[PDB]
Design a protein around this motif. Structure first.
Motif, PDB file in Angstrom:
ATOM      1  N   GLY A 116       0.894  -1.098  -0.060  1.00 11.81           N
ATOM      2  CA  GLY A 116       0.153  -0.071  -0.236  1.00 11.81           C
ATOM      3  C   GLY A 116       0.903   1.001  -0.153  1.00 11.81           C
ATOM      4  N   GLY A 117       0.438   2.391  -0.444  1.00 10.22           N
ATOM      5  CA  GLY A 117       0.906   3.561  -0.642  1.00 10.22           C
ATOM      6  C   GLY A 117       2.178   3.376  -1.577  1.00 10.22           C
ATOM      7  N   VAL A 118       3.204   4.291  -1.413  1.00 11.91           N
ATOM      8  CA  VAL A 118       4.476   4.266  -2.271  1.00 11.91           C
ATOM      9  C   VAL A 118       5.054   3.128  -2.052  1.00 11.91           C
ATOM     10  CG1 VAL A 118       6.485   5.319  -2.903  1.00 11.91           C
ATOM     11  CG2 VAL A 118       4.482   6.832  -2.554  1.00 11.91           C
ATOM     12  N   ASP A 153       8.234   7.329  -8.387  1.00  9.64           N
ATOM     13  CA  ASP A 153       7.553   6.458  -7.525  1.00  9.64           C
ATOM     14  C   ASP A 153       6.558   5.602  -8.203  1.00  9.64           C
ATOM     15  OD1 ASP A 153       8.771   7.745  -5.357  1.00  9.64           O
ATOM     16  OD2 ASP A 153       7.394   9.069  -4.792  1.00  9.64           O
ATOM     17  N   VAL A 155       2.995   3.613  -6.773  1.00 15.15           N
ATOM     18  CA  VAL A 155       2.108   3.513  -5.906  1.00 15.15           C
ATOM     19  C   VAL A 155       1.415   2.174  -6.069  1.00 15.15           C
ATOM     20  CG1 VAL A 155       0.110   4.587  -5.011  1.00 15.15           C
ATOM     21  CG2 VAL A 155       1.821   6.029  -5.642  1.00 15.15           C
ATOM     22  N   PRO A 157      -2.160   1.047  -4.571  1.00 16.66           N
ATOM     23  CA  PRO A 157      -3.291   1.219  -3.882  1.00 16.66           C
ATOM     24  C   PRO A 157      -3.828  -0.020  -2.961  1.00 16.66           C
ATOM     25  CG  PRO A 157      -3.860   1.788  -6.178  1.00 16.66           C
ATOM     26  CD  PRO A 157      -2.424   1.113  -6.214  1.00 16.66           C
ATOM     27  N   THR A 158      -4.131   0.306  -1.768  1.00 11.91           N
ATOM     28  CA  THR A 158      -4.474  -0.729  -0.802  1.00 11.91           C
ATOM     29  C   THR A 158      -5.597  -1.619  -1.316  1.00 11.91           C
ATOM     30  OG1 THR A 158      -5.817   0.960   0.604  1.00 11.91           O
ATOM     31  CG2 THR A 158      -3.582   0.515   1.076  1.00 11.91           C
TER      32      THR A 158
END
Ligand SMILES: [Ca+2]
Length: 158
Positions: A116-118, A153, A155, A157-158
Motif C-alpha cells: 500500500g501507498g508508495v 515512484d 504507488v 493502492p491498498t
C-alpha cells in the motif's frame, strides 16, 4: 564484447558495472503486473564476430528496495520464464555481430497483498542483474553488473 545503456553509459571489454534508470508505471494494483523491460535499455555487441562467438547469460538476478519488500515476480530471458530472484543461470544467447543487439531481459513483478501507498521510491535501487559473458575462443569469463534504479515512484493502492 561490450555493452551500453540507451542513455549513454557503457561497460567495456572485460566487464564491470553500470547504472540503469528505468521508467515504471506510476501505479499498479495488487495482482496486476509491473513490467520492467530492459531490452530497450541494455545493448551489447561482439567486437570480432568474424572469428569469435560470444555467449551471454543472466547469471544472477536479485531484488532490492521496494521490489524486495513488496513484490514477487519472474524474469523473462530470451522468451523463457524463470523465478525472480533467480537461483540458476539461464541458457546462453549468442552475440555474433558488431551491431548493438538488445539484452533480452524483462521483469514481471506483481505486488503482494500487503502492499500500500508508495511501494517503490524514485531513485531507489530495485534490482541487480548480472550478465555473464564467455566465448568460443579463450577462457574469458566476465560479469557485467547492471544496477537498476527507479526513475519514479510506484504507488500500489491498498
Ligand atoms: Ca557497436
Amino acid at each position: 564484447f561490450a555493452c551500453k545503456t540507451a542513455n549513454g553509459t557503457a561497460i567495456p571489454i572485460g566487464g564491470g558495472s553500470a547504472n540503469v534508470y528505468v521508467n515504471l508505471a506510476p501505479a499498479v494494483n495488487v495482482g496486476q503486473n509491473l513490467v520492467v523491460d530492459l531490452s530497450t535499455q541494455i545493448f551489447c555487441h561482439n567486437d570480432y564476430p568474424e572469428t569469435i562467438t560470444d555467449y551471454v547469460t543472466l547469471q544472477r538476478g536479485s531484488a532490492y528496495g521496494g521490489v524486495l519488500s513488496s513484490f514477487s515476480g519472474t524474469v523473462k530471458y530470451n522468451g523463457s520464464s524463470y523465478p525472480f530472484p533467480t537461483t540458476s543461470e539461464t541458457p546462453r544467447v549468442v552475440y555474433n555481430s558488431r551491431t548493438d543487439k538488445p539484452w533480452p531481459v524483462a521483469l514481471y513483478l506483481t505486488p503482494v497483498s500487503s502492499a500500500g501507498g508508495v511501494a517503490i521510491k524514485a531513485g531507489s535501487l530495485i534490482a541487480v542483474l548480472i550478465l555473464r559473458q564467455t566465448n568460443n575462443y579463450n577462457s574469458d569469463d566476465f560479469q557485467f553488473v547492471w544496477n537498476i534504479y527507479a526513475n519514479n515512484d510506484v504507488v500500489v493502492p491498498t
